[PDB]
């Protein structure tokens, strides 16, 4: 008969990596989380309480509830013609502050000063990022002694 | 200097091989000789030929330290008149021997008790052995600090005027 249990097909996903077994560090318990933060779900198999389901491993969502040792997360999931929002309740060891958002924050903080100066001197500056593009012409100086001639090789 | 060699303990062992009254008599013999309540050994495995059953009391033993140890050792080496084979010394710095009848040590015969024989073992070591047994920051003893097999013989010769076959 078919066997669709809760932890089926988790042999390699839910196992500790090489020479890295053991429970979490003490600094894991000092992380700061607020409502609306972005977060990553990474299952840690050395703690069997608050274990997320197979599918939600490696996904990203937003916080909507905080408790003594648990966190509620809003995660998207695609069901056959639409995307449904799921509310996942996991324990605090399987939660990681998301890093997908840091370029936006650094960009805002950095561009603020540039705008402040530009308006200070009454200027028209562009702050949108720039796609990589074609290159201008240059004059490249090379002595004739440093050029080496190559030709296809015979077969051995 | 202070790397002299002393006696860490002395372990006394008598394996009767059976439960019942004989083991308690042997325990009384140990109590009389050593003035300590002993404890009993339990068989790990099952062997039909020796008739041993799991968790069954088979033997009784005791361990002593200090002034009492150096004189029970003296009685034992007196019974053997200070004669030990070279094979008796392990490659780590210990030794021991045996006795066939417990009467020779000075215990009056008893029509109920019968004959009992025991083993002696010493476990020589130097001072600073506490670091390997303390709970807090237990560590290892360096190699030069250990006692070799030759030293267990030199110590015997000097201390007891013993004779090595």
């Amino acid at each position: 008969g078919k066997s669709r249990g809760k932890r089926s097909g988790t042999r390699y996903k839910f196992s500790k990596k090489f020479r890295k077994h053991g429970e979490c560090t003490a600094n894991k318990y000092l992380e700061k989380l607020n409502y609306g933060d972005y977060v990553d779900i990474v299952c840690d198999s050395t703690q069997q309480k608050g274990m997320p389901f197979n599918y939600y491993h490696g996904k990203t969502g937003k916080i909507f509830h905080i408790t003594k040792r648990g966190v509620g997360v809003l995660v998207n999931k695609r069901v056959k013609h639409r995307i449904e929002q799921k509310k996942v309740c996991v324990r605090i060891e399987h939660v990681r502050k998301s890093r997908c958002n840091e370029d936006f924050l650094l960009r805002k903080i950095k561009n603020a000063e540039l705008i402040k100066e530009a308006k200070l001197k009454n200027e028209h500056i562009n702050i949108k990022r720039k796609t990589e593009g074609p290159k201008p012409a240059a004059m490249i100086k090379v002595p004739p002694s440093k050029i080496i001639t190559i030709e296809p090789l015979p077969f051995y | 200097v202070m790397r002299e060699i002393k006696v860490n303990k002395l372990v006394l062992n008598i394996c009767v091989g059976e439960s019942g009254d004989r083991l308690t008599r042997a325990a009384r013999v140990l109590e009389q000789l050593t003035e300590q309540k002993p404890i009993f050994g339990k068989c790990r495995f099952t062997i039909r030929s020796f008739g041993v059953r799991r968790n069954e009391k088979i033997s009784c033993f005791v361990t002593v330290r200090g002034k009492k140890a150096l004189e029970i050792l003296e009685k034992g080496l007196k019974v053997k008149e200070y004669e030990l084979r070279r094979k008796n010394f392990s490659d780590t710095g210990n030794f021991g021997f045996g006795i066939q009848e417990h009467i020779d040590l000075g215990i009056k015969y008893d029509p109920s008790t019968g004959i009992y024989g025991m083993d002696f073992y010493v476990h020589l070591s130097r001072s600073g052995y506490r670091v390997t047994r303390r709970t807090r920051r237990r560590s290892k003893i360096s190699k030069t600090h250990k006692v070799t097999k030759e030293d267990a013989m030199k110590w015997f010769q000097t201390k007891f005027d013993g004779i090595l076959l």
């Binding site: 003490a26 000092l30 989380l33 003594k68 040792r69 605090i92 | 807090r136």
Partner: protein, 267 residues
């Protein structure tokens, strides 16, 4: 004899943490003692650290930060030489006094020593801290519980039960605790050791006789020092190194040490 410490044995080995490898930190008691409610954010959960070296005793207040925790107060036992207590700096009484000193000093830094008087001579909501006992085991009469008492007698609030004080396995008598706080057990030992083994009495308590502290005036010196500690707890306000530390060689140097070794071997 097959070898166990093989090359493949070393390749697969996973090492423990440094302070577990050194026998210092528990790491299961630490995290339970530090973690607070995730929805109770911006609350720090101070903890009262007590360590007892060989010939001393230490107390602190820590705060468990992310890059290394922070010490808010400190008190060592040898400071009691200044408050009028000579040798005997491992006692139950020494522990009590060191626990008192840390509390009084900590309150002074925050200008709160006038709103929290503690208790007078031994017979708002206070600041709370939790007791970290390190690696020792907790029997009855363990010296760490004297420090807890000396700090609760100050202005602090350390949550605790009553069955681990001396002689209190199943019933709490305060008089026998008070005896150990004033070092009366030491006094009676000096008494009883004097009658028999009169020379062993002189060998055991050498540094007491030298300082003129007799078995009839022990309690009064601890009583005086308690008042003195309450009166003023503020803190009081390169080396030659005749022996030298060698350095590390480099790849270039190590090659000629082998050249010369082989050259010497050749002859």
């Amino acid at each position: 004899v097959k070898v166990v410490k093989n090359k493949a044995y070393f390749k697969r080995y996973q090492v423990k943490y440094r302070r577990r490898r050194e026998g210092k930190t528990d790491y299961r008691a630490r995290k339970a003692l530090i973690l607070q409610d995730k929805n109770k954010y911006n609350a720090q959960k101070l903890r009262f650290v007590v360590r007892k070296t060989n010939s001393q005793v230490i107390c602190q207040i820590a705060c468990a930060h992310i890059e290394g925790d922070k010490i808010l107060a400190e008190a060592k036992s040898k400071e009691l030489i200044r408050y009028g207590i000579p040798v005997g700096l491992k006692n139950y009484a020494a522990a009590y006094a060191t626990g008192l000193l840390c509390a009084r000093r900590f309150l002074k830094s925050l200008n709160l020593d006038t709103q929290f008087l503690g208790v007078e001579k031994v017979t708002r909501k206070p600041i709370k801290a939790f007791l970290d006992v390190g690696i020792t085991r907790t029997t009855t009469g363990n010296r760490v519980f004297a420090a807890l008492k000396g700090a609760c007698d100050g202005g602090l609030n350390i949550p605790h039960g009553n069955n681990r004080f001396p002689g209190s396995k199943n019933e709490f008598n305060p008089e026998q605790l008070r005896k150990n706080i004033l070092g009366i057990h030491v006094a009676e030992y000096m008494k009883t050791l004097q009658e028999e083994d009169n020379d062993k009495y002189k060998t055991h308590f050498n540094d007491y006789l030298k300082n003129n502290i007799g078995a009839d005036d022990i309690e009064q010196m601890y009583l005086n020092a308690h008042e003195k500690i309450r009166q003023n707890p503020e803190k009081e306000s390169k080396f030659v190194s005749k022996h030298e530390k060698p350095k590390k060689l480099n790849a270039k140097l190590r090659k000629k040490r082998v050249k010369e070794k082989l050259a010497l071997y050749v002859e």
